[PDB]
Structure formats: C-alpha cells, structure tokens
Write an enzyme that holds these catalytic residues in place. Structure first.
Site, short mmCIF file in Angstrom:
data_model
loop_
_atom_site.label_atom_id
_atom_site.label_comp_id
_atom_site.label_asym_id
_atom_site.label_seq_id
_atom_site.Cartn_x
_atom_site.Cartn_y
_atom_site.Cartn_z
N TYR A 34 11.11 33.62 -0.71
CA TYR A 34 12.19 32.61 -0.59
C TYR A 34 13.54 33.30 -0.39
O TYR A 34 14.40 33.32 -1.26
CB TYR A 34 12.25 31.70 -1.82
N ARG B 120 18.93 30.17 4.65
CA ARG B 120 18.03 29.47 3.74
C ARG B 120 18.63 28.13 3.35
O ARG B 120 19.85 27.98 3.25
CB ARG B 120 17.76 30.31 2.49
N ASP B 121 17.75 27.15 3.12
CA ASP B 121 18.14 25.79 2.71
C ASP B 121 19.04 25.15 3.78
O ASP B 121 20.18 24.79 3.53
CB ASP B 121 18.82 25.82 1.34
N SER C 263 20.94 25.63 -2.50
CA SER C 263 20.18 26.87 -2.61
C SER C 263 20.42 27.81 -1.44
O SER C 263 19.54 28.59 -1.07
CB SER C 263 18.69 26.58 -2.75
N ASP D 34 10.59 24.85 1.84
CA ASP D 34 11.48 23.95 2.59
C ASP D 34 11.63 24.30 4.07
O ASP D 34 12.01 23.44 4.87
CB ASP D 34 12.85 23.88 1.93
N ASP E 133 18.42 23.60 -10.35
CA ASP E 133 18.23 23.29 -8.93
C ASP E 133 19.51 23.40 -8.13
O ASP E 133 19.43 23.47 -6.91
CB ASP E 133 17.69 21.87 -8.73
#
Ligand SMILES: OC[C@H]1O[C@@H](O[C@H]2[C@H](O)[C@@H](O)[C@@H](O)O[C@@H]2CO)[C@H](O)[C@@H](O)[C@@H]1O
Length: 358
Positions: A83, A88-89, A95, A135, A313
């Site tokens: 991850y 990312r995200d 995140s 994701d 989160d």
C-alpha cells in the site's frame, strides 16, 4: 480450488498491532474490558507496508516467523499489505501517501517492491500472503473521470503489475484488492470490474500465486447480512457474499480459478452509516468475525482482518493537507487523528461492540 494459502500454516501474529494493542489495553479503565482488548493481539491481522520505512519491519517479521517455525515445528505465514502506490488514494484525501508521480513516483515504487522482494527472498521457509494495493483497481473501475485517478491509471497498472510479477518470483500468495459490495458489487459494475482484474491477471502471466481478490478491506460490510443495511438500497448485492457469488463466476469464465479473502475486522456492528460511501472512522463499529478458513462459500479462502481496527482512517482537522470531508460526517468519530495513527477511543468501542463478543 486446490491451493488455500492458509492450509498447513500457522499465522504469525503482527508485532506492530500487538504493541499498539498492549499499549491501548492498559489505558482501558474497565478491568474485564481491558482483558478483552488485550486479547485482540492474539487475533491474526494484516500488517500494512504503507511506507518504505516499514520495510525493515517486514525483515524482522520474516526472521521472527522463521525462528518461531523452527522452534515450534510449524510452518509460519506472514500477512502483509502492499500500500504505497504513487498518487495513492486518488479519489479521496485522507490516505495520500509518501510517493507522488511528479516526484519520481514510478521509480520509488519499483525500488519499494524490489526491497520487499529482497527481504522475502531471504526466508524461503516462511510463507507470505499479500493484499495488493487497496482501493487502486477499484478506483480504475468507477473513478476514471477523477482526473487524479485518470492521470495515474497507467502508473497504477504498471506498479500493480510490477508488484504482482516480482512478488511471484519469491512465491508470495497475493489477493488484489477489489473494493467491496457497495463499490464494485453493483450488478452493472461486475463485468467492468472483472475485465480489469482479468486483464491485470493476464498481464502478470496468470501466475498461480495470484490467488484472487480481497474485498471489504478497511470497510464495514457484512459478509452475510441477517437483513440488508438500509444504506444498500438499490443494490441486490448488499453484502460481501453476494458480491463475491456474482463476481467470481465471471473470473472463472476467463479460466482464472479465483478465490477471495474478506475483511471482517470492523464488521461486527451493522447499520452504522448514513450513506454506503461513508468509510471514514464510522462511529460505533465493533470487531467482527474472527479470521477463519471455514468461510461457508465456495469462493472464499478466508475471513481475515486486514485493516487494523483502532488505527485511524483519516483526520477530522480541516487544516491538514490530508483532510477529507468524509472524515467529518455525522457518522464519523471525531475528533480523529491522522490516518494510520492510533485512535484510542475508536479501539475501545471496537472492543466493547465486538460481535461475536471477545
Ligand atoms: O472502503 C475504503 C475506501 O473507500 C473509497 O471510497 C469509495 C467507497 O468505499 C464506496 O462505498 C463508494 O463511495 O465509492 C468510493 C470511491 O469513490 C475511498 O476512496 C478510499 O479512501 C477508502 O479506503
């Protein structure tokens, strides 16, 4: 299916989670509740390699696993999450990670994977099971009109391919993240999702180590709902067993005997959301069904705990660059620290509300 990665292995308990849980339980004032919380560190969870600094941790976990195996006469299994994608995200803010495409992202990620491969290569006697990039692929099914996702599509596919191809050479069993029932489980999304996953599978050479898909990671869906959550209105696949029963046959048509793992780590309490898309620190969640291979579904290798409950989160502070308005909704626990950091009050509620009880 023939090859369940968990059969004949002893799971190595996460020391990272264990250190968080041991610290959190001594701060819980109720004595029996503190005992229950402390017991969470004996439940297997996935450890997130959510940044390069975590790679030495993976080093120590494999070496401890090897030793545990030799001393207990068992074969050990280490559970990890890849991850650290560049950009990312891409459809949220909470995140956002340490790599970006405009800052040498592709190369940084390939080096990230290389260094992980070089660790795992030193411990052939330890099995690894990895969830690949939560994701990412799902964003490429439903979020291509998000310009951040569209601009990172080719990077996502290249990097995911690089992870799959190279982790296969050291024998890593891998489940690509495939969202959840409210994301890709919508009947109209099933075929576009399958086309992507089978393209990704084919591009990685259909390696036998690509076991299949992971669902519900860091979400809260039921695996088998007693009754459909009201947020699921309009979706016949209101739970993960429905999503998986509908998606897995498409994968088999293309010749991929695909199996699944399902996060239930925060699924113990249903009906906790205003909208299905409310994913951030949902108030009142409990720990859900303990990890097991007795899943009741022909497609599911294991119920698992992927997202470590109690790790935040995302922040509710709108002055942080990682602020996401989802983390301020009425069903989101606030105030909340930065994503990935410990959220002590959320962990206590996870313990108190655990279903089945701890
Ligand atoms: O589930 C965790 C991820 O959810 C992502 O938002 C999804 C959401 O899960 C769906 O229910 C629906 O709202 O589609 C969203 C994508 O636009 C979120 O982007 C991630 O940050 C979460 O980890």
């Amino acid at each position: 299916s023939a090859n369940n990665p968990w059969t004949g292995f002893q799971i190595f308990l996460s020391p990272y989670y264990a250190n968080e849980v041991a610290a959190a339980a001594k701060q819980i004032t109720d004595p029996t509740l503190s005992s229950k919380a402390a017991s969470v560190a004996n439940i297997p969870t996935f450890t997130w390699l959510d940044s390069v600094a975590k790679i030495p941790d993976l080093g120590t976990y494999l070496a401890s696993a090897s030793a545990l195996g030799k001393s207990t006469g068992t074969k050990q299994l280490v559970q990890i999450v890849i991850y650290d994608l560049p950009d990312r995200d891409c459809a949220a803010k909470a995140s956002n990670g340490e790599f970006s495409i405009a800052n040498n992202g592709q190369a940084n990620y390939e080096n990230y994977i290389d260094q992980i491969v070089a660790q795992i290569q030193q411990f052939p006697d330890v099995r690894v099971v990895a969830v690949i990039e939560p994701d990412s692929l799902a964003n490429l099914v439903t979020n291509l009109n998000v310009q951040k996702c569209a601009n990172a599509k080719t990077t996502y596919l290249a990097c995911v391919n690089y992870a799959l191809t190279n982790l296969a050479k050291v024998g890593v069993y891998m489940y690509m993240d495939a969202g959840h029932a409210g994301w890709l489980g919508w009947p109209a999304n099933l075929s576009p999702a399958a086309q992507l996953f089978t393209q990704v599978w084919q591009n990685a050479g259909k390696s036998p180590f690509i076991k299949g898909l992971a669902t519900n990671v860091a979400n809260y869906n039921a695996l088998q709902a007693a009754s459909p959550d009201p947020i699921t209105q309009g979706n016949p696949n209101y739970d993960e067993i429905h999503y998986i029963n509908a998606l897995a046959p498409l994968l088999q048509q293309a010749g991929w005997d695909a199996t699944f793992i399902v996060d239930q780590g925060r699924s113990g309490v249903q009906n906790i959301r205003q909208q299905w898309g409310d994913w951030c620190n949902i108030k009142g969640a409990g720990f859900g069904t303990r990890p097991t291979t007795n899943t009741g579904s022909q497609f599911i290798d294991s119920i698992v705990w992927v997202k470590p409950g109690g790790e935040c989160d995302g922040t509710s502070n709108s002055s942080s660059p990682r602020y996401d308005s989802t983390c301020s909704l009425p069903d989101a626990a606030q105030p909340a620290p930065e994503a990935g950091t410990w959220f002590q009050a959320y962990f206590q509620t996870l313990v108190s509300a655990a279903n089945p009880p701890l």
